[PDB]
PDB file of C-alpha atoms in Angstrom:
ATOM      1  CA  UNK A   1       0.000   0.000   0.000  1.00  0.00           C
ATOM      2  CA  UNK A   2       0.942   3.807  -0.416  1.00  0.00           C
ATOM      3  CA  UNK A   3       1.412   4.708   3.303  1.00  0.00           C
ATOM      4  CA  UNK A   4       4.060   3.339   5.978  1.00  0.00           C
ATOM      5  CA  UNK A   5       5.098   3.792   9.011  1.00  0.00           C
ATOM      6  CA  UNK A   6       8.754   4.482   9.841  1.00  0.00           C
ATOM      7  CA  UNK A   7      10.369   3.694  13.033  1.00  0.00           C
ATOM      8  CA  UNK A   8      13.167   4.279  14.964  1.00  0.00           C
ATOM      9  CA  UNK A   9      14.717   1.273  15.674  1.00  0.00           C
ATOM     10  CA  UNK A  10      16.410   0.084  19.245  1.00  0.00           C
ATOM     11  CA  UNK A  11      20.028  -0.059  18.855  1.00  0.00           C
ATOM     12  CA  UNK A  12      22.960  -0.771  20.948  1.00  0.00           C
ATOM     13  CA  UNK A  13      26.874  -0.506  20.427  1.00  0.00           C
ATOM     14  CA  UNK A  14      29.238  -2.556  22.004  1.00  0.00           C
ATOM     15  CA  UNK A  15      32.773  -1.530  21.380  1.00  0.00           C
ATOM     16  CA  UNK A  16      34.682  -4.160  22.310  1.00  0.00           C
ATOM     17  CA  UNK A  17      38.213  -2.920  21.124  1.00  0.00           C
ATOM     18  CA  UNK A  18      38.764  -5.141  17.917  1.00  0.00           C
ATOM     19  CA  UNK A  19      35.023  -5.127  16.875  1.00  0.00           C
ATOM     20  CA  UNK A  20      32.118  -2.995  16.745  1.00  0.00           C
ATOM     21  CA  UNK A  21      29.746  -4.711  17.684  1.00  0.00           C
ATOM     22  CA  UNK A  22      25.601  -3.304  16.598  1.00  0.00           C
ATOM     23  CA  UNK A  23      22.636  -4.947  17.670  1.00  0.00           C
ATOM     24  CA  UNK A  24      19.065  -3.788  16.754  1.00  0.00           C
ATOM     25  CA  UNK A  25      15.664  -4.686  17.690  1.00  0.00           C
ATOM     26  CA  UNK A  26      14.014  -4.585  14.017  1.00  0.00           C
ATOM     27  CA  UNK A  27      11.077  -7.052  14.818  1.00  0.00           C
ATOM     28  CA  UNK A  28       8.602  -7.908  11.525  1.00  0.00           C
ATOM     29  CA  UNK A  29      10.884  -7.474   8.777  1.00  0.00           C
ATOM     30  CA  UNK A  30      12.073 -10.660   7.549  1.00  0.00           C
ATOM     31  CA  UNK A  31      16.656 -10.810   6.810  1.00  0.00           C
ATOM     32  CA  UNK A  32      15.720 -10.310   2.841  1.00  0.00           C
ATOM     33  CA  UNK A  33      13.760  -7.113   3.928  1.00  0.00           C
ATOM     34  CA  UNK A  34      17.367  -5.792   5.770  1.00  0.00           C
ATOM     35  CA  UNK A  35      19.820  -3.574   4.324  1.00  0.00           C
ATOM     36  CA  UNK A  36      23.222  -2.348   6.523  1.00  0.00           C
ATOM     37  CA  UNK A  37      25.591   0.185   4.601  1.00  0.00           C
ATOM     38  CA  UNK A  38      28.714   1.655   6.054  1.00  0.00           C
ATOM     39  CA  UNK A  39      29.061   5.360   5.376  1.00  0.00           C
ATOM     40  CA  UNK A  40      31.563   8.002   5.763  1.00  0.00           C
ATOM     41  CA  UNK A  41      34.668   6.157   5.475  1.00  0.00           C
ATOM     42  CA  UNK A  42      33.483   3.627   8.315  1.00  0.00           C
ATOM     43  CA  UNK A  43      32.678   6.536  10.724  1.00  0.00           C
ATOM     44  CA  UNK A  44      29.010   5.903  10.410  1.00  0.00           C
ATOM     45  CA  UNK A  45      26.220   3.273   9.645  1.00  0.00           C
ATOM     46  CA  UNK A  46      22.819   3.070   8.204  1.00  0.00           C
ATOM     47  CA  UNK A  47      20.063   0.705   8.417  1.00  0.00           C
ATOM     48  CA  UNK A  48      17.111   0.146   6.255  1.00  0.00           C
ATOM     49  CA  UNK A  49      14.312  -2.383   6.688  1.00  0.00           C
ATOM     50  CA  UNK A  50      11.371  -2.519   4.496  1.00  0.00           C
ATOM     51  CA  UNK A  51       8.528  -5.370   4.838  1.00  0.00           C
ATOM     52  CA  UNK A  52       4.875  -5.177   4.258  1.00  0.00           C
ATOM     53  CA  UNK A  53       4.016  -4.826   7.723  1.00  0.00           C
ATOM     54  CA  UNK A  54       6.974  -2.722   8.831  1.00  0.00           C
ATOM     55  CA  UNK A  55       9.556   0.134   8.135  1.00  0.00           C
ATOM     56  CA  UNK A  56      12.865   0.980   9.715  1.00  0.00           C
ATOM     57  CA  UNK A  57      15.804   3.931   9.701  1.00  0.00           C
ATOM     58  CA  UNK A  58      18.793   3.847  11.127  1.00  0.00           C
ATOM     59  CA  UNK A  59      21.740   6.208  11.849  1.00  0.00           C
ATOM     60  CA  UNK A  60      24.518   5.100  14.105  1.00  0.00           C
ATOM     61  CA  UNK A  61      27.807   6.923  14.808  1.00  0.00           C
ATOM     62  CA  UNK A  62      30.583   4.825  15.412  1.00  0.00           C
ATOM     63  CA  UNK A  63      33.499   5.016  17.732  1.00  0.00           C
ATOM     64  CA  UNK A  64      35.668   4.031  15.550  1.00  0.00           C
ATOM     65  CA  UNK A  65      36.986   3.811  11.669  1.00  0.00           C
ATOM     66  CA  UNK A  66      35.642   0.057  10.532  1.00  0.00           C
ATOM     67  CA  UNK A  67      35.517  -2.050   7.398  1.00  0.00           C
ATOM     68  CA  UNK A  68      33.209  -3.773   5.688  1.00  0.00           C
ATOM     69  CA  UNK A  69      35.686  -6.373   4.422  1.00  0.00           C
ATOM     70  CA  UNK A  70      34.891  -8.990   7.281  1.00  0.00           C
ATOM     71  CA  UNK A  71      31.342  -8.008   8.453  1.00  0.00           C
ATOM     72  CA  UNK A  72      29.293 -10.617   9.496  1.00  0.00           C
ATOM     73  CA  UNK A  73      25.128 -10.334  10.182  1.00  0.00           C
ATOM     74  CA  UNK A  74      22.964 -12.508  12.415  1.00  0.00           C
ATOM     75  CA  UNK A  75      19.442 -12.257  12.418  1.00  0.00           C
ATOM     76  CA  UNK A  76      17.177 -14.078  15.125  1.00  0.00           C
ATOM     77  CA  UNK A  77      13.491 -13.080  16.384  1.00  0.00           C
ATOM     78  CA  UNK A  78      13.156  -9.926  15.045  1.00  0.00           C
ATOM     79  CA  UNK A  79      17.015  -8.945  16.407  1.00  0.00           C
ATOM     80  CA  UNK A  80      19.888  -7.794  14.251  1.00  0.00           C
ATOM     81  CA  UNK A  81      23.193  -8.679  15.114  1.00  0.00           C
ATOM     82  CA  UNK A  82      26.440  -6.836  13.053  1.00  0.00           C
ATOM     83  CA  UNK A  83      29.826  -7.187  14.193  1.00  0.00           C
ATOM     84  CA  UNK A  84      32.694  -5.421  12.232  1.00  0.00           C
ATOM     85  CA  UNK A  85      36.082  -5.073  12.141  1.00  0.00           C
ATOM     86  CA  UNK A  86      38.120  -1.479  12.610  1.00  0.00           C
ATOM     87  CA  UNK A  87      39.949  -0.292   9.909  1.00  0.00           C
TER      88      UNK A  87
ATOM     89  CA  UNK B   2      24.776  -8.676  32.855  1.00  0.00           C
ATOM     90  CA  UNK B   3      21.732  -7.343  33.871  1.00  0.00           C
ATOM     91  CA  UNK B   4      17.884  -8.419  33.559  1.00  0.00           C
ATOM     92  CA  UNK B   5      15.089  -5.930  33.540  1.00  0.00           C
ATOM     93  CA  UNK B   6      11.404  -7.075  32.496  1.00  0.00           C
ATOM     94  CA  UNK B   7      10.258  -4.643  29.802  1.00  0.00           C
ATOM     95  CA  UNK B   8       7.100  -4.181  28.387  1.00  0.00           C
ATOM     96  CA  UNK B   9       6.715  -5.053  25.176  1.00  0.00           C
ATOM     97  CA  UNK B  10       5.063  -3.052  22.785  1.00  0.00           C
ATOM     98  CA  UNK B  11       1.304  -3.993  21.951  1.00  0.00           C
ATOM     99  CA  UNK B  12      -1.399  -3.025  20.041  1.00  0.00           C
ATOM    100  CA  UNK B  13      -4.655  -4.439  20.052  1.00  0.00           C
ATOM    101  CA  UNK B  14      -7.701  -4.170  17.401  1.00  0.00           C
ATOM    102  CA  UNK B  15     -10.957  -5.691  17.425  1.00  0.00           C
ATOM    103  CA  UNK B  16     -13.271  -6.244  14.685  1.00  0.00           C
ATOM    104  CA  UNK B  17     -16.331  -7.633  14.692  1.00  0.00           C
ATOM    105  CA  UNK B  18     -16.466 -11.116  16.513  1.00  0.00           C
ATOM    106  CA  UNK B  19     -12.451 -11.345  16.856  1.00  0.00           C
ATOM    107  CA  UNK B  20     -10.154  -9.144  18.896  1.00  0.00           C
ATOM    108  CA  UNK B  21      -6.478  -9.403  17.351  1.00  0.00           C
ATOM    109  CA  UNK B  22      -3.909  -8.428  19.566  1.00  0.00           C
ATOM    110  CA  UNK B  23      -0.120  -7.341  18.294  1.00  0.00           C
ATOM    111  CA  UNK B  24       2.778  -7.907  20.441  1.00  0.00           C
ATOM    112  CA  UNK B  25       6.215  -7.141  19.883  1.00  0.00           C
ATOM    113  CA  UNK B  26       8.827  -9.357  21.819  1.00  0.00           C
ATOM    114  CA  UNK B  27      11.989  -9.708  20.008  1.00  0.00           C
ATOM    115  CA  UNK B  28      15.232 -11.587  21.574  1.00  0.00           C
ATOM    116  CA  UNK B  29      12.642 -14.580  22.608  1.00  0.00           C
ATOM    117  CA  UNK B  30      11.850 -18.029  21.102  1.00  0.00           C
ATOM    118  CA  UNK B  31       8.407 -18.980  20.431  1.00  0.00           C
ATOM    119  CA  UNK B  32       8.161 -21.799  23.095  1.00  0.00           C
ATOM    120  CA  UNK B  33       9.564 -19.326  25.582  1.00  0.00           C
ATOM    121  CA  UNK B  34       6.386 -17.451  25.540  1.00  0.00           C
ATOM    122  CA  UNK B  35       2.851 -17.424  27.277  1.00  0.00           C
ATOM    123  CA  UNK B  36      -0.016 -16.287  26.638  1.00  0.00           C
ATOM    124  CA  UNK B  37      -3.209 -16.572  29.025  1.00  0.00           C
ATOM    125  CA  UNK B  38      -6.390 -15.065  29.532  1.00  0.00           C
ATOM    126  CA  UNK B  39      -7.711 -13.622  33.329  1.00  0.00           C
ATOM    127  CA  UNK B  40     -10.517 -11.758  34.946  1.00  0.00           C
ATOM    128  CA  UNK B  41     -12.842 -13.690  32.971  1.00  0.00           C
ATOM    129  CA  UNK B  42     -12.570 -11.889  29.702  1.00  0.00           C
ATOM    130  CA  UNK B  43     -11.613  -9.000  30.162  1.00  0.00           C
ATOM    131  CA  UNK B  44      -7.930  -9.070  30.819  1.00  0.00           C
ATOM    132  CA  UNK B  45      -5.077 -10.902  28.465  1.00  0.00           C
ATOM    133  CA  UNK B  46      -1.650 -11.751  29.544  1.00  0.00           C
ATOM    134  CA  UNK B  47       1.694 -11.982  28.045  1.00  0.00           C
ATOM    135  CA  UNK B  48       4.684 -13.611  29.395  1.00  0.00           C
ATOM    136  CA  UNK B  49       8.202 -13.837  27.187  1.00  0.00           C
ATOM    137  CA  UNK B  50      11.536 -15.003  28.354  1.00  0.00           C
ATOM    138  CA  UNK B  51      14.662 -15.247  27.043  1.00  0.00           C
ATOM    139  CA  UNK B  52      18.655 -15.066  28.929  1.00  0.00           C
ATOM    140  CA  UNK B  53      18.995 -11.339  26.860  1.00  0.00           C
ATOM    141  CA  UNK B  54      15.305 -10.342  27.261  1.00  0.00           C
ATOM    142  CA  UNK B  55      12.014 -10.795  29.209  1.00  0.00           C
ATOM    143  CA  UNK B  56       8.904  -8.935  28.774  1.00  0.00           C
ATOM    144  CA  UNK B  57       5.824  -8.734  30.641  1.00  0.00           C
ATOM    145  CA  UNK B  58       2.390  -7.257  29.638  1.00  0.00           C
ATOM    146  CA  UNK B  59      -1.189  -7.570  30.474  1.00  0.00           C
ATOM    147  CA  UNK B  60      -4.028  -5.859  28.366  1.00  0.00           C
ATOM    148  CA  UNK B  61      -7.243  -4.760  29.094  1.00  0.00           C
ATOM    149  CA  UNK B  62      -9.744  -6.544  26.415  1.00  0.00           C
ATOM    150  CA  UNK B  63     -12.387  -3.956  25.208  1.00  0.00           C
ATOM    151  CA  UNK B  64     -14.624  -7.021  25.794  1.00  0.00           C
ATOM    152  CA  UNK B  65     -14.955 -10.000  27.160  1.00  0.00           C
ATOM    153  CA  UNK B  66     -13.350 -13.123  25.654  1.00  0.00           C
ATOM    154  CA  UNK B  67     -13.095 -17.089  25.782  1.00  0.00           C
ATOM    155  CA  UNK B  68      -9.685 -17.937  27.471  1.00  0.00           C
ATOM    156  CA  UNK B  69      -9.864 -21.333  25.571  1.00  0.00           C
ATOM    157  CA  UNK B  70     -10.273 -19.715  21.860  1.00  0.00           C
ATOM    158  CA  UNK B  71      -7.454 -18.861  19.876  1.00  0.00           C
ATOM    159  CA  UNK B  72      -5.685 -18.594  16.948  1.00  0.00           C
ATOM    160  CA  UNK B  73      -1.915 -17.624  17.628  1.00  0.00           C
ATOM    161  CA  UNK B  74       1.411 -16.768  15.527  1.00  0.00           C
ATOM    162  CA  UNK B  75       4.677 -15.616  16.036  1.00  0.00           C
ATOM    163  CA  UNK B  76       6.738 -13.828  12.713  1.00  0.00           C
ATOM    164  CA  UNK B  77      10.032 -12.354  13.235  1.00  0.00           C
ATOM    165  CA  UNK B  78       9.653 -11.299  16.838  1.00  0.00           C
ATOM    166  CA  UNK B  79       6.135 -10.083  16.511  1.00  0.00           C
ATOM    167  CA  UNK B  80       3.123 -12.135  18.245  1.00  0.00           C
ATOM    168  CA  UNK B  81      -0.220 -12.089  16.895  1.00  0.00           C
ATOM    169  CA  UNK B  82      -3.028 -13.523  18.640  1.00  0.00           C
ATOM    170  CA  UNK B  83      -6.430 -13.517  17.814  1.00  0.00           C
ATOM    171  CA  UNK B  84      -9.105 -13.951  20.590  1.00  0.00           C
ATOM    172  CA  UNK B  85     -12.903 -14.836  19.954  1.00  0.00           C
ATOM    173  CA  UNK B  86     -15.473 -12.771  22.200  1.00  0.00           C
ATOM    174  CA  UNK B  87     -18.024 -13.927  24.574  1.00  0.00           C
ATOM    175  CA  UNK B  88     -21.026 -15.313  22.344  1.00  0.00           C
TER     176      UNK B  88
END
């Protein structure tokens, strides 16, 4: 349909010092519906989720410079789980 | 590693003979939640647990309802339950 509601998703950062680690609480989007994209040379992320019965936006600032070389993504019960590796 | 109970986010619709209500309890496996029905119909109650996350909620039904009816689902991290009113 035309109309959607966009949330802000619950997010957490755990820096442990050689990963970053994100976690996010995108519940009723399936993993398809998910899209993570590091921005600003690693400084910052983004997250989109689109699904027919829900939208989310994300916009984290990161504490440090990270790649997307060895990223890895989990996705269990409506959780996201992205750990990367500083550049 | 800390526990606090949360409460999940819910939202609850009825139409016509069915009330359908929405809960949002990501982190939590379907067999670790419960669902019951109290104060004859009018009240429904929602237990999930999980070692990262528990939630606890109980709604007020805008009618009553049969505890033993039900139709239930769980997608993503988002439980749907549908509840049949009082003939």
């Amino acid at each position: 349909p035309m109309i959607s509601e966009e949330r802000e998703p619950l997010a957490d950062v755990i820096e442990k010092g050689d990963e970053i680690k994100v976690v996010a609480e995108v519940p009723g989007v399936n993993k398809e519906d998910i899209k993570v994209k590091v921005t600003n040379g690693g400084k910052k992320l983004v997250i989109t989720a689109k699904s027919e019965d829900r939208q989310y936006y994300k916009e984290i600032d990161l504490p440090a410079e990270v790649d997307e070389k060895a990223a890895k993504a989990n996705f269990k019960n409506g959780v996201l789980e992205i750990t990367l590796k500083k550049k």
